[PDB]
């Protein structure tokens, strides 16, 4: 959880443009499928429209 390799940048022709970017730290952050499901569950309720008889 400390490796930050170099990521290629590809040209529009689908080839490695020779440039590189170090992998951002955010891609090493903990993967929490339950924090995601909690957050997705509750945020998706926020674009609802009320219904009532």
């Amino acid at each position: 959880a400390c490796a930050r390799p170099l990521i290629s940048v590809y040209s529009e022709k689908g080839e490695s443009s020779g440039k590189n970017v170090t992998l951002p730290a955010v891609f090493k952050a903990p993967i929490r499928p339950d924090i995601v499901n909690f957050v997705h569950t509750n945020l998706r309720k926020n674009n609802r429209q009320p219904y009532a008889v």
Binding site: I7, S8, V9, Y10, S11, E12, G14, S16, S17, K19, V21, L23, V26, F27, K28, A29, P30, I31, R32, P33, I35, V36, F38, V39, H40, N42, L43, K45, N46, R48, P50, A52
Partner: protein
């Protein structure tokens, strides 16, 4: 006046965005999400800034 909307802590919502980005860089998880990335050159896939124009 059913309670349609939910508050989610900013710290947790940001957590949920870090988990998503971290997961998006693992072929096993992106494959297991149904995406056909069996021939993309690399993960994460970074293309040059020309495509923005």
């Amino acid at each position: 006046w059913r309670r349609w909307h939910r508050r989610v802590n900013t710290t947790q919502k940001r957590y949920a965005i870090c988990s998503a980005l971290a997961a998006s860089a693992l072929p096993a998880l992106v494959m297991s999400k149904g995406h056909r990335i069996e021939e993309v050159p690399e993960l994460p896939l970074v293309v040059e800034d020309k495509v923005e124009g």
